[PDB]
Amino acid sequence: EAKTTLFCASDAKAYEKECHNVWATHACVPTDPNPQEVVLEQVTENFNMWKNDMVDQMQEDVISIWDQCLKPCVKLTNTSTLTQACPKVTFDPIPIHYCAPAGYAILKCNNKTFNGKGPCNNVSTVQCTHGIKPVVSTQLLLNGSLAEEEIVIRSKNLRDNAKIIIVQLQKSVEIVCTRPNNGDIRQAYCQISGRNWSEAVNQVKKKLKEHFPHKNISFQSSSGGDLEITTHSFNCGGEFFYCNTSGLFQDTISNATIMLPCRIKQIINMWQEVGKAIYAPPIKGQITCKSDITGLLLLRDGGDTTDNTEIFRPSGGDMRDNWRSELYKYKVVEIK
Ligand SMILES: *[C@@H]1O[C@H](CO)[C@@H](O[C@@H]2O[C@H](CO)[C@@H](O[C@@H]3O[C@H](CO[C@H]4O[C@H](CO)[C@@H](O)[C@H](O)[C@@H]4O)[C@@H](O)[C@H](O[C@H]4O[C@H](CO)[C@@H](O)[C@H](O)[C@@H]4O)[C@@H]3O)[C@H](O)[C@H]2NC(C)=O)[C@H](O)[C@H]1NC(C)=O
Ligand SMILES: *[C@@H]1O[C@H](CO)[C@@H](O)[C@H](O)[C@H]1NC(C)=O
Ligand SMILES: *[C@@H]1O[C@H](CO)[C@@H](O)[C@H](O)[C@H]1NC(C)=O
Ligand SMILES: *[C@@H]1O[C@H](CO)[C@@H](O)[C@H](O)[C@H]1NC(C)=O
Ligand SMILES: *[C@@H]1O[C@H](CO)[C@@H](O)[C@H](O)[C@H]1NC(C)=O
Ligand SMILES: *[C@@H]1O[C@H](CO)[C@@H](O)[C@H](O)[C@H]1NC(C)=O
């Protein structure tokens, strides 16, 4: 159980102008062409997704990616003002693998319902993690991995309402967000199957109810905070989308097609550090991301629930939680 400096590996192509590729060609080595996995027999190891230095390293790398790929024109902090060249770039996240250096291995939990904190009974050793897209978002976790058997609820302590709940879905729900070619260059929309979304919500609700027996599970919109957190926010092709999810986080959801209104914003509250980053107006043309919703970030309301209802609202903002949603099954160990 030691802290070491992981290295990254990817399939980035040197000819590719896409920024994640450009960053990874310099920062990472090539993906392991022949990866070996060794099942450890009759072995139990403790994992803690909430105290895992792998998360802090990924955070540093995504910050480094965004420093190259999403350079704001103006960056404001309470101690600083920066004005700089801010060219548009080609942006589409690629998978990144995190790898143990010599004298260290990465243990991988293979229990398919492991909650991320406690003993794992089916462990194997790997050199590198599977490829993980560094997708930055709030509310909905996009383009990540699915739970194999059932929905998994992950929290440092479910009884602490202040702690984020990471939900991992078993079945993904598609979301297509589009700023059409064109009147209002900042208006966009997402389309999602209400049938599929509603089924996901119902399954997540049933899993939550197992931890709050005799309580009715309600989903509601965020109580307040920055727009990054009160909307589903993500970057699509270099543009910052803010998508209203009032249609999603409700107790009555239609089985028809749901349309979410979105805005593209130039002024964003940064996740990397406290401050504002100001970007140039959106590129021309159709901007579209079709993504798989593979998880949720939820916060449960605190206080006496007079109604016998537990209320859950979408949340996010600390992108370490995004990385935890993928790194929960891994831990770095010193071989000897
Ligand atoms: C979640 O994950 C999904 C994928 O799993 C992401 O969706 C992908 O988004 C990328 C880019 O945003 C898509 O790739 C782009 O596709 C464009 C069209 O591709 C079709 O048409 C071309 C041309 O005929 C075919 O060759 C191709 O096979 C497809 O049939 C391309 O035009 C793009 O390439 C262009 O720009 C690049 C920039 O580097 C240039 O190098 C190229 O020369 C070219 O000009 C690009 O390849 C991809 O298709 C999407 N996948 C799916 C399944 O939709 C989501 O964006 C992601 N969500 C988030 C939030 O990150
Ligand atoms: C800037 O903000 C941080 C916390 O966000 C605070 O600790 C620091 O004192 C602030 N500095 C100034 C000059 O306001
Ligand atoms: C995986 O570990 C969890 C947590 O103890 C346990 O409930 C479950 O039975 C385990 N699954 C298997 C297949 O051993
Ligand atoms: C729901 O998901 C299934 C597969 O996951 C897909 O075939 C179907 O088209 C989706 N429903 C809608 C309305 O898009
Ligand atoms: C989302 O849209 C609903 C209905 O138009 C509105 O009441 C709510 O204030 C919006 N939320 C955000 C964060 O835009
Ligand atoms: C969708 O919901 C309506 C009622 O709101 C119902 O009549 C219809 O059968 C449902 N469709 C499916 C495929 O479940």
Numbering used by the authors: 47 to 124, 198 to 301, 324 to 396, 412 to 492
Sentences from the paper on this structure:
Two forms of designed gp120-based immunogens were subsequently engineered to bind and activate germline HC/LC VRC01-class B cell receptors: gp120 outer domain-only constructs (eOD-GT6 and eOD-GT8) (Jardine et al., 2013; 2015) and gp120s modified from the clade C 426c Env (McGuire et al., 2013; 2014; 2016). Here, we present crystal structures of inferred germline VRC01-like Abs alone and complexed with 426c-based gp120 immunogen cores and compare and contrast their gp120 recognition with structures of mature VRC01-class Ab/gp120 complexes.
We also solved structures of unbound 3BNC60GL and 426c.TM4△V1-3 (at 1.9 Å and 2.0 Å resolution, respectively), and a complex structure of a 426c.TM4△V1-3 bound to 3BNC55MAT, a mature VRC01-class Ab. We addressed potential changes in antigen structure resulting from germline and mature Ab binding by comparing structures of free and bound 426c.TM4△1–3 gp120 core. We compared the unbound 426c.TM4△V1-3 structures to those of 426c.TM4△V1-3 complexed with Fabs from 3BNC60GL and from a mature VRC01-class Ab, 3BNC55MAT. Since these immunogens lack the V1V2 and V3 loops, potential rearrangement of these regions in the context of the trimer upon binding remains to be studied.
